[PDB]
């Protein structure tokens, strides 16, 4: 058996703040994938999050 894989992910957070004023930005999201054999109804997912 021989196998190869390639992956690439680019993320941009953008925040507006005043001078000298502290600020925060916080987010998370979930992405799902449909498992095979849809009669065998199931999902897989993962959550990505950044602060």
């Amino acid at each position: 058996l021989e196998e190869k894989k390639q992956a690439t992910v680019v993320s941009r957070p953008v925040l507006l703040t005043q001078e000298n004023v502290p600020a925060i930005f916080d987010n998370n999201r979930t992405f799902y994938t449909k498992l095979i054999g849809e009669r065998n109804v199931a999902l897989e997912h993962v959550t990505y999050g950044t602060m």
């Binding site: 916080d26 998370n28 065998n40 199931a42 999050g49």
Partner: protein
């Protein structure tokens, strides 16, 4: 992101331990229900239902014991 405590960690170890049993028991029960008398379905289901019973017992008793070990220490701060 959400908050999870020490007892949640202890509990979760079991869930991630028994990888698929939660789905196995459901599908084995539907396959049995389709033909309520087939020796291979009965023999499979008896196993999976037993493994499930033991899993839920060991999980809940462990979490109980840890709760008491903590309460016994907190009491002494007073």
């Amino acid at each position: 992101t959400p908050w999870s405590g020490y007892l949640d960690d202890v509990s979760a170890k079991f869930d991630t331990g028994v990888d698929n049993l939660q789905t196995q028991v459901t599908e084995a029960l539907d396959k049995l229900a389709a033909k309520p008398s087939d020796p291979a379905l009965l023999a499979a289901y008896q196993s999976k239902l037993s493994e499930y019973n033991l899993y839920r017992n060991a999980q809940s008793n462990t979490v109980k014991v840890f709760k008491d070990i903590d309460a016994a220490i907190i009491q002494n701060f007073r």
